[model samples]
Target: STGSATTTPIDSLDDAYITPVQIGTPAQTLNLDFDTGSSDLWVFSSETTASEVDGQTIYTPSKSTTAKLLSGATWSISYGDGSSSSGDVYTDTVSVGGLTVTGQAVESAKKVSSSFTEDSTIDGLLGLAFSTLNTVSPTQQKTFFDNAKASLDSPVFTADLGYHAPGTYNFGFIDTTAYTGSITYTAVSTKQGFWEWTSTGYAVGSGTFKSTSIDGIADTGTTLLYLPATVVSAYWAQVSGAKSSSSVGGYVFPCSATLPSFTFGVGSARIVIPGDYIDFGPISTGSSSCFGGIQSSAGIGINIFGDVALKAAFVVFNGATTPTLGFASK
Candidate 1:
């Protein structure tokens, strides 16, 4: 079980986010978001203009003995969602839950925009996704996990999401009780540094599987599990009264009946997603329907296993040992 400290840059919204650790003291609790897409930890500062610092929590470096700033290292990151931030690099003591790591490398963004400034609740982001995508400078490129690897009981960490809460992301040591045994792993592609996978096949209930095989990548950054259109339609057909609604995103279904169990072929492994995941319905004014756990991305060309799918299993990223990912039951 190898867990690498990864980073992802995020544009904060108006709501408070949860981090694995609490910052500051008992009187003032600071929770942040940890992303694996970019490698930088940043919080707003009191020196920032009131208008510019509307909704974000500013970390007072002077108040914490662990907080330190780097002289001239600059950093900036933009997301596919069209949000961005820029700042300087620093080293500080970062605490998650009761666990504190000293001299953790991070980024302190100075000039933030209103889109990011408005989020007063969430202080910053802790990236634990992938090291190759880290945004920190090469000269000072060690992440918090990279620095704390020696102290951890196991070289592994798992994110347990707060199901009822949207942004409640938890991190830290892997719970051995959640896993059965050693995880089966696959080496990542050297080209993109992404986990490359081969699908064995797919199944709906006890029958109805694609005659042909499919393949793709599993990404946590993506929200939906995309499949080829034909594969999706065929699978949905087995859901008793499941139907395709045009007003919805094409895969909307209205079956009170449980969806047939679907299993994905991952090499020699057969990963099963329970029926509860397939009972997704409408969420709002738009006819856009919420799909069960698995859906079709047939028309999209590229297939992706998003976070919803990943939540079903424990994913391990072995960056330090081997560029591999181990999937286990939680």
Candidate 2:
């Protein structure tokens, strides 16, 4: 069967998207980051150290009659930002939207990095990546999507990310009305444990599309878009007062800079990100300089087409026997 849920941005900058998830027999609801970049359904829990817990909600497995400790099972995962979390595992009934997965691996965190503790908006992360990326040691676990895909009417899910607004994650089916034009499908490689694909090229504003193939991952968990240094430089150079900052650690421009649209190719289709989206937000309160949504992925190794770009289109993560990705302008 198909299921759908609404996901919302945490801040005006649309730093990350979080969706509601219910865990346990009594169904304790928690707002969780639906991350496609990683595979680990981890959460803040009763097992978390008191010192590390802030105002975030915690999943107390002990309170759930359906919760069962996965004996000797433990997991730890690190993010690109260096934040990490680790804890023991539990199998419990987990529900998203109206879809339920019994015996879903729910990682109960005993320790979390400062970033997680400080971000009270999200209780934890529900990873949507391939199970091969799961971090549980000794006996790795499958992601909720992996466990549920077999029973789903269609082995697929779609992401319709929005800018500073509520979006939708539809499992098992694609909504035709959610996007315009026919979807452009492309092959996805799961070898890297991500929804990795190659874009035919990109164009800065009205410039000609550069026919350089760029490989990147579709990451809703990440805040911004990252691309090759040369591409990032080209995009920002068009702005009147923009420069790469060593202190701020990314490209920044005047707060009122006249930004240009960015378009990336998928086969013969092109998805365009509005200029308003490229103007991320102020670096600090009342700062005259604003950070750019598109930055250099030079340090990141692989390019990331994060929320900044994804929000510009409707994306489908096809989990069919032979996986593929679909993009359509919305």
Candidate 3:
């Protein structure tokens, strides 16, 4: 339910792609992605065609003495980003950061795309996010957490995204070293996939927007904050000439001045979004106009508070005990 997950850096000699954690041991090494948007672990295998394996890492079971196939089962996954992959089911003695967990569920993807195949840096995604998002079935499914829970020194898993790298993410046991004190926990709603929550209100500067109450979900898979148009406009109004520019594909504004701090209320906890994140990756078009982190998702159903907002606080997804998610300060 609450534990730490550890991982080790792995470099593939056969190819240029290197993952922080490698699947299997001396028998084999399968590359995987450590994703927070999903809860299942899958890999690309020999069944994948040479064309499909172009930029992706493929696992050769024969290369490893510890690899085992599921024989009859199969798998397919579709992401919101309009990417998909399918494969056969398999099992192996998986290891992360020198910690071995046997009988781990792994999918040997037979089909993948150029975006997935050509990316030699990563073989597959190691989903460490939430179990509710898992595409696997209850009868024949296995997760990294489910397998590691039985052997981890602690029962809590924490993810630390490295400051400099894009995909520099780490998992394994929750080390509270970065945390200042005890973490606050929140009650989770049992709907499905992605940790969602209810927002009481929002604040800009010192003014609170009580009428702008909303409910939303937090997703690590996305980069921008997807909120209602009204809220987005209201928040943008605080900045000077913060108009929607077509260049960045969203609201673009000048970053010459300091912007007011914005905070969102989640139950009793008030999480603040840093100003730098508001104008992520400042791009220059002739002049130095930057793109705003806030975007318009008008009819997109739910608010997706992505990594731009999530990186500021410590979050807990408690799938081990019950279908609940909690939030607290680091």
lDDT of 3 by residue, 17-43 (tens): 134445564645555556566666777
lDDT of 2 at 322: 82
Off by over 4 Å in 1: 1-17, 22-29, 44-56, 110-122, 137-140, 160-174, 180-182, 208-221, 228-230, 236-251, 254-261, 278-303
Q: Whose TM-score is higher: candidate 1's or candidate 2's?
A: 2
Give the winner by lDDT: 2
Off by over 4 Å in 3: 1-19, 27-31, 53-56, 117-120, 129-132, 136-140, 162-173, 205-213, 245-249, 255-260, 282-289
- Cα lDDT tens digits for candidate 1, 1-330: 133222222321111225534444322234556544445566666545556776666766667665566666777667533667767766676666545666776566666766566655556666555555556564545666666666766555554332223422223455555556556676555354345555657777787555456655656554446777777776788766566666655666654456776667655665566666555455454544445556666655556765555655666655546555666655
TM-score of each: 0.71, 0.99, 0.78
The candidate, 1 or 3, that scores higher on TM-score is 3
The Cα local distance difference test for each model comes to 0.56, 0.94, 0.62
TM-score of 1: 0.71
Best by TM-score: 2
214-269 per-residue lDDT for model 2 (tens digits)? 99999988888999999999999999999999999999999988899999999889
Local distance difference test, candidate 1: 0.56
Alpha-carbon deviation at 322 in model 2, angstroms? 1.4
